[PDB]
Design a protein around this ligand. Structure first.
Ligand code: HEM
Ligand code: HEM
Ligand SMILES: C[C@H](CCC(=O)O)[C@H]1CC[C@H]2[C@@H]3[C@H](O)C[C@@H]4C[C@H](O)CC[C@]4(C)[C@H]3C[C@H](O)[C@]12C
Ligand SMILES: C[C@H](CCC(=O)O)[C@H]1CC[C@H]2[C@@H]3[C@H](O)C[C@@H]4C[C@H](O)CC[C@]4(C)[C@H]3C[C@H](O)[C@]12C
Ligand SMILES: C[C@H](CCC(=O)O)[C@H]1CC[C@H]2[C@@H]3[C@H](O)C[C@@H]4C[C@H](O)CC[C@]4(C)[C@H]3C[C@H](O)[C@]12C
Ligand SMILES: C[C@H](CCC(=O)O)[C@H]1CC[C@H]2[C@@H]3[C@H](O)C[C@@H]4C[C@H](O)CC[C@]4(C)[C@H]3C[C@H](O)[C@]12C
Ligand code: FES
Ligand code: FES
Lengths: 359, 359
């Protein structure tokens, strides 16, 4: 009987096939909510065509592309089935995928949401921890959309802008870690170092007051608390790109460092991006890993699987949307506060957009 | 009857009067566990001699010195009181103050503990969040003492090396925040920005894998959690000393940035050091205060009071020692893992010292 409440699942998206790498990078380097460059409209196209090969090669190393679209759709379907039974008064619920750099683009999703004449629209970020470069950018695109077209929303908007410590999210992480620990030799289970690895941020972003580092750190603590501190751990940062300073310890140097110090069993945990993505140097480069073994004698380096399709995850997503609906919140209290050194005038416009929504 | 169980309260200490500033700084710049300098025994004395004036001036700005000794004794007394009732089997309990850079020095306390013929010693750090530069140095001192004294412990040791999320520590923080929120105008109370301010670390220490940032971030989340996210917040880092890069955002830069962006009511929270200490630029310099208020219109900048003498705090300390005793742990799981890029050979020796303890 026609969709009443829409759930816009926000994420950066990812190249479906190596053939999509170029336009993925193009939009990424063009995103001013993510980064600002001189003559950006001219430089973005250049940087894209340039790194495309290097990035296609990395995706080939992981299967030939990103499975984010499929995974997100599967979780989206599962979330809906639960919501339709959990919240009959807001049903039927329908999910929309809003990727930032690839189709379905955020704008394309909003446009479709408007045409379906939904009553309520929920901007639901798929990043548990908040960064102005990920969730912030996705939220800004929504504000940018209506402002671009030059007209007001025909729907009631609200947002779930962060959920770093949602109990079911923490349970899923704990479950996957225990599962992977089972794959290490029984005699070494106790010695396994749990290395939580999240994507790093440039120090310039960290220093302007980005919320991300603190929230990822919160997720980590909740997870270890659930696991009753069964193993030692560290929160490290990966995939750092460029010569500029990024928040460390770097994941690669940390793995090597740990091996040089006798820790031969390591469990990497994707603590800040719920879908499979590009792995680290010691996981992909046979040369680097072999040397590490010859010199330090590394025994086991495993990675916990992504929350990809765990049914308990869809339940996590449905639980979040449900609670949100019951609370009547328009956004978290944290969104009402911009970075201390924020220099993007769109940010607060986006904030007002959500806090000023009807209902 | 004689002291059965001894509780060694570890901290860096602080100059009791302006006259004690020099040797405080001398012992600090000489600390290898906190700082590694070339020909350190040569440069330390010089640095101390040169910084004394500036540091004496800072302490004068806050009353003439540090109240850490008095406060730690009072808390220690209260802790012992509660312990003799809570843990009859390990009673009588006696607390010893072990400061790193001032009397009573860590070594003096150990030496006295030995003479008291205790049946069990507990190295209890007063820093709830672990850093190799704070708790690590104090623990390494215990190992360095027995090692340099060329003798073995006559007591069975164990350590409470961290407690970033202890439920009563969190309750004390929330109580002090609510209490301070009451000092702002009722109409503006919901507009107050809670700025958790912790002492920063050099980026070189952060990148080596220091545990501190993630643990401080955990304390913050637990506190806001208890406060049910009543106000927006940010975790910033203060007193970064020197020209080298330290973890930001800086407290001074954030306060200014915030004011320039409309946030006129700010509540500073001493989230990582439980005793009064040097305040920030906008709390001391009258000139910066004026400039800021003139071109930003700051309305209220308040600092929550240090957990200094809150009885619930003494209760927190006793609750910790009690659980620690019943758990029979020798140290936390986290202490068994060194920084992935640790280059201090003593660290690993200190670890073995505690994990190898009898019982
Ligand atoms: C302002 C901070 C950030 C900047 C400047 C940034 C930049 C970039 C760039 C340039 C790429 C393209 C890859 C390349 O060309 O080498 C990329 C990819 C990516 N970024 Fe970020 N990023 C930031 C923060 C984040 C955060 C917080 C996350 C976490 C969820 C993240 C997740 C990703 C993912 C998942 C990819 C796809 C690559 C992969 O699978 O590893 N990024 N980022
Ligand atoms: C490894 C990194 C650190 C370095 C290099 C460092 C260095 C210093 C120095 C040189 C001083 C003397 C004052 C000055 O010359 O400016 C000082 C004082 C002090 N430090 Fe640190 N420190 C570090 C980490 C920390 C941490 C993590 C804490 C947190 C508990 C801390 C708490 C203090 C306190 C409470 C004082 C007394 C002065 C004040 O109130 O600011 N320091 N530190
Ligand atoms: C000058 C600008 C930084 C401006 C600023 O910080 O205020 C920096 C950041 C991005 C840099 C560009 C990107 O790194 C992409 C290219 C990298 C090449 O090695 C040089 C040209 C190249 C096009 C760089 C030119 C210049 O160093 C840029 C444009
Ligand atoms: C890694 C990439 C260059 C890739 C390449 O040359 O092949 C460079 C070029 C543009 C750079 C970004 C832009 O200079 C804009 C930002 C500048 C800040 O000082 C750091 C973050 C910041 C977001 C930079 C991160 C990183 O250094 C980037 C993304
Ligand atoms: C060279 C050494 C760093 C060595 C290293 O990183 O391997 C650095 C760190 C501490 C520095 C010293 C400290 O900053 C104290 C002094 C600061 C003055 O501005 C220069 C001399 C001065 C004495 C510095 C000399 C030199 O730059 C030092 C000694
Ligand atoms: C803060 C102080 C300068 C104070 C002043 O000029 O008033 C400077 C001079 C010596 C510096 C220290 C020395 O350079 C030795 C270390 C160098 C590392 O890169 C950072 C930590 C490190 C321990 C430095 C901390 C801080 O930058 C110090 C202590
Ligand atoms: S960059 Fe964080 S609020 Fe604008
Ligand atoms: S410096 Fe952290 S364990 Fe040695």
């Amino acid at each position: 009987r026609k969709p009443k409440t829409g759930i816009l699942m926000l994420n950066m998206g990812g190249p479906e096939t190596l053939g999509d790498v170029h336009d993925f990078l193009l939009r990424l380097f063009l995103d001013r909510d993510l980064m600002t460059l001189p003559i950006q409209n001219k430089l973005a196209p250049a940087i894209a065509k340039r790194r495309t090969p290097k990035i296609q090669e990395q995706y080939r190393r992981i299967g030939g592309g990103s499975p984010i679209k499929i995974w997100t759709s599967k979780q989206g379907e599962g979330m809906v089935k639960l919501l339709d039974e959990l919240s009959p008064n807001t049903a039927p619920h329908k999910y929309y995928i809003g990727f930032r750099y690839v189709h379905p683009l955020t704008e394309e999703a909003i446009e479709e949401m408007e045409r379906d004449g939904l009553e309520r629209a929920i901007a639901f970020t798929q990043y548990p921890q908040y960064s102005c470069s990920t969730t912030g950018s996705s939220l800004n695109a929504i504000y940018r959309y209506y402002n671009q077209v030059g007209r007001k929303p025909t729907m009631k908007w609200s947002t779930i802008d962060r959920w770093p410590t949602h109990h079911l999210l923490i349970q899923c992480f704990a479950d996957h870690i225990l599962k992977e620990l089972d794959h290490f030799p029984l005699e070494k289970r106790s010695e396994v170092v749990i290395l939580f690895s999240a994507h790093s941020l440039p120090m310039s972003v960290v220093n302007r007051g980005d919320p991300y580092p603190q929230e990822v750190s919160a997720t980590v603590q909740k997870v270890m608390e659930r696991l009753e501190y069964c193993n030692p751990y560290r929160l490290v940062w990966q995939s750092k790109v460029g010569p500029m300073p990024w928040l460390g310890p770097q994941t690669d140097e940390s793995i090597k460092g740990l091996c040089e110090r006798g820790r031969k069993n390591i469990l990497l945990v994707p603590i800040a991006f719920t879908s499979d993505h590009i792995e680290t140097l010691y996981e992909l480069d046979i040369e680097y890993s072999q040397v590490l073994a010859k010199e330090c004698g590394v025994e086991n380096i495993r990675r916990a699987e992504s929350l990809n399709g765990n049914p308990l995850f869809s339940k996590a997503l449905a639980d979040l949307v449900h609670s949100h609906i019951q609370s009547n919140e328009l956004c978290s209290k944290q969104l009402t506060l911009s970075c201390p050194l924020c220099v993007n005038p769109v940010c607060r416009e986006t904030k007002s957009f959500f806090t000023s929504q009807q209902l």
